[PDB]
Write a protein that binds this ligand. Structure first.
Ligand SMILES: *Cc1c(COP(=O)(O)O)cnc(C)c1O
Ligand SMILES: *Cc1c(COP(=O)(O)O)cnc(C)c1O
Lengths: 457, 460
């Protein structure tokens, strides 16, 4: 078959991200070629159909098969596929997009957008900017960046260091200096007997303790996803963001909001920052910026950092930072069409409405399930965490592969939901066009899967 | 399709768009006016006011098939309609990325290459390289063997670790770079070589400097050496005769991996398939971007040799799935753009054009500028070339940087409708035209440059 020939070429020549390299190459872990899709459904090269309740990777937010977006990419590609944006050069779509991000989407007090292609390159830029900012101000020691356990901020050297999951550290010598990781903001794993408000205060106090141990004048920034994505779909505890921000303000520490997942509608607000009342100095975007139709990332720079960057150019000349593809015309054109759709179909409001329905349905269906320790989520992201003992929150032996098994049972029933890393967790992040009826279908399939695995154990 | 309201767009630009590599205050205030590029065809681009320019820099060494390829726009469009995106994590794939991987390995990359890993930028690809080099040494039980040796004036990206690799001060100053464990050895620029050394002697001097560095560091602590076959952003600097052979012998003696950064030289520019082919390099790892898609869509590649690949597979045995991935790794539309780009390069034999019209280019530049009083050196290979300007040709004396001699020659070219780059940290005029360029277009470029160089020479 054509699939067999392609799979063969794949195994012989393609190094996949996040794959068992030996077992892929040998054919021990079979591959899958995705060829098409529409709305929330995708299709493989053998014609099999799947409900994609993970929207690729939290990213195909307007759904699959938007010919509107393909048309917009095509028109830009015909007119001017590329020019650089170095030394004040520009193109029409990147200018239009920058104005739209600032005026209509980003929180108030944001000033400028800098572009790359990945969440990783955007967070790399953030770190560079934070160091530069402190050097411009004559604070050479104020450089440490505090991230969080289970946070996800990319897969590079410095960005993998920010990331708080061991797969991105082990055997890569990370994290490097000067990165630190504070408390995982996951109430389910809070110290025993803590209320939610107590746990938010515990997180704040642990951060303070870290800042004092480091010396506050050496701590430049704090980076956090409003809701943790890859670390297990973890909304923050009640009062967390207010308690954290008071500590950061007390010690003059910049806040970076990593909105790569929460950006552009997924929580039911425009950004996760809007949803939780965060006031970041710097914002990272990607994924839902284009619904993955073309690669694009953004660093949204607040007025306070921007003023210092302008001061920096006065004293030091043009900023020594650029990517060849910064502000790429076709990627910008894809973003514009994507945002047109999000606005026109009010997918932010759908994420709030169908999302609340999703969360309610998940709680009803799984809140008393013997296998499920916690049901959590906000808007159109949700997860089920599985435990061996609900009373003591005891984890399964990782060799039992409980999460991966529930995910595999879902896939047998034609639905894609992710076995989240470093845990037994089933995550959902469907396209923002999903209907309530489609939510029912997803929940029903998950219910059958969770039951099947529970019976086996 | 539609005219552009230039004044209004320029205004929105200044108020909201943070450009790469721009004077941020002067851009925002309007003191450095912007330029909006709206169109292009072949080697010419057009701004929003309708002005036309010959782009002798191919954007940034990247628009290699030339501008306005509707064939590539069609291929992007067909993939975007069929499947704009899915991830390639856990063995998932798409048809164009599989096809591209096979074509890169079987038809383009040097012998002994095994696999391709994908990103979107030269910078993210070199970031992947460093991760892979450290992982490789950890798999082998050599935790100390981690240092990466780069070179003065080398260019490898604009990130934290990649900017550290980069050997130009603009990417270091006020960013606290370079970090450990990066080192920089000798700039392979013969024009600035110790006086009275032949080219081959200077190659041996560079080899000996590298060896000295390795011994001072302790060879068991040195993991890899990274180099562009020909330096791009560091001033269009072909290596001296014998350089790559002499370097490789040192790297082999001390079990040090070679990374070839082919972001510029990859896919035809030197008149060979890769710079590695052209100079007889045998890299363990290869970085590509730019000419991989002719910039029609963002894509980068890390080409992994058989020796590193074997250890990566061994690593998976020991440690499980590799903890590395970008969301857009193997992006379908970017892969489709690459395939159409490579079809054009192969069909029109742009590698051969780069050799033929390139040799003509180099010869024409020598004839025109080899005795010019302002020009210390004419250099290049294939379709990259530079003029380096000096205040005294006998002693190779540099101009006071405040005279801005390089920027002024570039600005005079632009007045005459041609884009050629004032290269950073020196007085150097660089050329890297699209690979479709004709001899006739080379004559036009050379003539414009001649007038520009004469004009600035008169002013001094
Ligand atoms: C996916 C993700 C990233 C990394 O983006 P890439 O485009 O994969 O580099 C960064 N931060 C968060 C919060 C993400 O979810
Ligand atoms: C341009 C360049 C890079 C970085 O590529 P980006 O796509 O700009 O990140 C790396 N290496 C070399 C030799 C380059 O010319």
């Amino acid at each position: 078959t054509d699939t067999d020939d392609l799979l063969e070429m794949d195994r012989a020549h393609f190094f996949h991200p996040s794959t068992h390299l030996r077992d892929h190459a040998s054919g021990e872990l079979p591959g899958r070629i995705i060829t098409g899709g529409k709305g929330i459904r995708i299709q493989d090269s053998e014609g099999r159909e799947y409900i994609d309740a993970f929207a690729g990777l939290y990213c195909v937010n307007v759904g699959y098969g938007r010919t509107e977006i393909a048309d917009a990419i095509y028109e830009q590609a015909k007119e001017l596929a590329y020019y650089h944006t170095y030394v004040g050069h520009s193109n029409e779509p990147i200018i239009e997009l920058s104005e739209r991000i600032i005026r209509e989407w980003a929180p108030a007090g944001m000033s400028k957008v800098y572009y790359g292609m990945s969440g990783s390159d955007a967070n790399e830029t953030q770190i560079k900017l934070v160091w530069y900012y402190n050097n411009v101000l004559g604070r050479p020691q104020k450089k440490k960046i505090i991230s969080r356990q289970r946070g996800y901020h990319g897969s590079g050297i410095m960005t993998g260091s920010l990331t708080g999951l061991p797969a991105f550290h082990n055997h890569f010598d990370l994290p490097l200096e000067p990165i630190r990781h504070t408390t995982c903001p996951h109430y389910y794993r809070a110290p025993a007997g803590m209320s939610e408000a107590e746990f938010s205060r515990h997180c704040a106090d642990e951060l303070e303790k870290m800042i004092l141990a480091e010396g506050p004048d050496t701590v430049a920034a704090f980076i956090g996803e409003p809701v943790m994505g890859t670390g297990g779909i973890v909304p923050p505890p009640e009062g967390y963001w207010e308690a954290i921000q008071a500590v950061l303000n007390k010690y003059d520490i910049l806040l970076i909001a990593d909105e790569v997942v929460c950006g552009f509608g997924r929580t039911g607000s425009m950004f996760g920052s809007h949803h939780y009342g965060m006031k970041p100095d710097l914002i990272t975007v990607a994924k839902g910026l284009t619904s993955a139709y073309a690669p694009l990332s953004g660093v949204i720079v607040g007025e306070k950092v921007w003023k210092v960057l302008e001061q920096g150019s006065d004293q030091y000349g043009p900023i020594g930072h650029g990517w060849t593809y910064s502000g790429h015309p076709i990627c910008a054109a894809a973003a514009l069409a994507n945002l047109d759709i999000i606005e026109r179909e009010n997918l932010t409001g759908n994420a709030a409405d169908t999302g609340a329905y999703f969360q309610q349905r998940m709680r009803e269906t799984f809140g008393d399930h013997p296998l499920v320790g916690e049901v959590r989520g906000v808007g159109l992201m949700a997860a089920l965490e599985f435990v061996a003992d609900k009373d003591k929150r005891t984890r399964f032996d990782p060799s039992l592969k409980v999460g991966p098994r529930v995910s595999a049972a879902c896939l047998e029933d034609g639905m894609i939901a992710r076995a989240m890393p470093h845990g037994d967790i089933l995550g959902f992040a469907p396209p923002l066009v999903i209907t309530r009826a489609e939510v029912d279908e997803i929940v029903d399939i998950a219910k059958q899967a969770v039951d099947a695995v529970a019976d086996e154990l």
